[PDB]
């Protein structure tokens, strides 16, 4: 489809609107792969989830995949994407362990291999950072060639990571992460980027009328032939 | 093999689901063609989709069809089902009049035809009668080569009509209808059946597990290659 | 799509045309489930698909199919149609084996289940006999709503069988044959009809302009949302111009 | 989607063959298919295979086509090169009807996005790619992946470059300007189709598989688009890791 760009009233309609999306997906009759977000964005998208599926075993051939993962350091625990995706949806929402596909450092060079053998990605729920970055495509840094690829933590970076994604301290920051690169998520079948804040308004501004470049991560996207955006007013602000 | 088959606990969830389902067509970037019945199963459903796309502008490539029509005779009012859709649904809803399709005796000839330039119909949303019918295909008369036809209206069928659609008053009942034929409802993309309450439960056993049969029409649904079916304990309490 | 009705001059186009709509699934680049028709009428189609696959090593996820099997009464070896699949196509073609799956008695309880975990049949491509049979799915016999069964061979069908599928050897006949019913071929995900010669003409009217009826088994075909026809002018010849 | 597929034909001719065969899935398929088709020589065969299976018959009658770019000939008012190649190559001898036939043009480029999205987009864009990577109109440096269908000056260096890939040659007729989908308009394809063939384009096939995404390389985009299939013979994949 032609971009589409769906601006809502506010964060409740977004949510509710792109939880309807989904839904397609959800309740498509044979096997689909989705690729799902953690973070604050799609909360309320998947308390809407929820209350869709918990307690129904007939969306039992709905597979779910992180795109990201930051172990914790020292830890053997599981790292903090998939524990928020359990927090925020795979618990509440009752999903069973057999639907739920983990990306980690181990994996990850055979997480490609495995998505094409599943049939590949059939939609990807992303969200969009202030920078413009996606999934753990950082600005600058970001490779348009990438695949499933690791990222070393340096610099900077440790005190961000501590304070936003990990949310805890300096000494749980590991040596690096994994993220779906930009060709493995372009590589889904279909994409649906949510958008909620004044805070996204700049980003959004440079995806859907900005150059392709690698400062602002996201603007490869608009190139996606199947690219559905659902943004609020406040994210939407920028856009002419 | 393809058919599913859906078991929700009552006619609120039966609802909620089946609401899900078509919202994965209403969510949909392209042109979507909606067949849709009209009656009391859909009520609960039409509530759900009402409170998802009302005063909503960005589903307005969803088209919707009615599937059967019977008019007031000697009125040039639109018809029984066209008049319960707006109520349960289009009106309510805010449906863009361009983006509602009426079928009468009028063009019933012409809208096999019109329906494949539109690209065909994505999806058809049909209830089970307790006697097996679909649209207008009742037992016996029922032909399954049928596309869209006009069936006369004698002998006992006057009062049924009259009691069951036009409140017992047996002079508004016209010489005719126009339905779908199995043949017409047979081509959609896909068929999505709901079904409600223990006096449908023996229909939809003859459905999933009867022989195709004139006499039991929704029998033939069986064979249809993209078949789901959304029904309550109450209506699936004869199944094994 | 409205079922689409297909006319060429002669057999030779009527297999070319035919060759062109199976190699759009051949040549789809995820996996793609296929059921092939044995018999007389897709000879030349299989001569144009080896020429187009063999020695071709990028179609590995094409998965094909046979849809009924009638086994060599007392034999041990593999079944007519899978016999005459190979002869017609697998064995020139160069398939795999592991991309060729079987149907026999054997497994048939399993064959419905094992192609929707497959992902289902994306295509059918079946012939039309002269009495409007599909598969082994004949005149009377028939039960629109049967998936793979068994069918037992009794009466006049002992000598049909022997002289049109065992040259005419009626020790070889088995008690019994294979065929996905009425209700497994409507399930796959389009259909291809293809239809040749003179003898094809009265059961091809029937087929498009006739009621649905267990008399003439192919006449439930129009119901599938997604059918192509393609036939050539003889077996076009009852059709309404 | 798919994860790109690489097809290897031992030649011209396999390559050309292979080539219609995946063609041939969208001109068969029973509703409308809108299908993007390149000029130059290395869907000549190619076209002589279509002509073949589509010559005289009348029941494709819902594909339609159309160019992605075009170059018209400097003060003339003649159709311009790529739909008069393309004529030559295929409508003309295929019999295909001018109501299928969707041309591309300077006045209607502003159009073109707009057309095609509300003819249901395009369905498969059979493309080449150039011995430095161009595809289209999309040419090394100049190129903006961002761009749609847009209208590109022609100066200096570009002029033989344009004469020798898309007007045999010829710098007189070489226009003031050109139209090509841009890098999104082609992305906006539900389906891409790369045919390569010979040694010249060997280099450049390696740098779009193996190397990064960049302006210089533009065809370096397509690698990730989620349907792609590339079509090459052996000396076209003759750098690529075996
Ligand atoms: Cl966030």
Redesign the pocket.
């Known amino acids: 489809n032609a971009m589409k760009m769906i601006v809502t009233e506010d964060y409740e309609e977004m949510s509710l609107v792109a939880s309807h999306h989904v839904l397609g997906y959800i309740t498509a009759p044979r096997r689909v792969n989705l690729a799902v ?1 953690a ?4 909360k309320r998208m998947y308390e809407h989830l929820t209350a869709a599926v918990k307690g129904k075993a007939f969306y039992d051939r709905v597979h779910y995949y992180n795109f990201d993962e930051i172990p914790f350091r020292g830890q053997s625990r599981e790292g903090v994407t998939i524990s928020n995706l359990r927090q925020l949806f795979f618990t509440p929402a009752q999903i069973k362990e057999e639907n739920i596909h983990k990306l980690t450092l181990d994996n990850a060079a055979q997480h490609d291999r495995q998505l094409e053998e599943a049939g590949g990605l059939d939609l990807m729920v992303l ?1 969009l ?1 202030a920078d413009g970055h996606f999934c753990g495509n950082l600005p600058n840094t970001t490779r348009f060639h990438d695949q499933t690829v690791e990222v070393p933590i340096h610099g900077e970076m440790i005190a961000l990571i501590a304070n936003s994604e990990m949310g805890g301290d300096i000494s749980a920051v590991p040596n690096s992460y994994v993220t779906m690169g930009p060709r493995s998520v372009m590589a889904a079948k279909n994409l649906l980027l949510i958008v909620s804040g004044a805070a996204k308004a700049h980003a959004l501004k440079q995806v859907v009328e900005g150059p392709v470049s690698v400062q602002v991560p996201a603007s490869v996207l608009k190139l996606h032939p199947s690219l559905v955006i659902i943004a609020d007013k406040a994210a939407a602000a920028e856009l002419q």
Chains 1, 2 share one sequence.
């Open positions: 977000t973070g604050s964005t799609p969200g950072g």
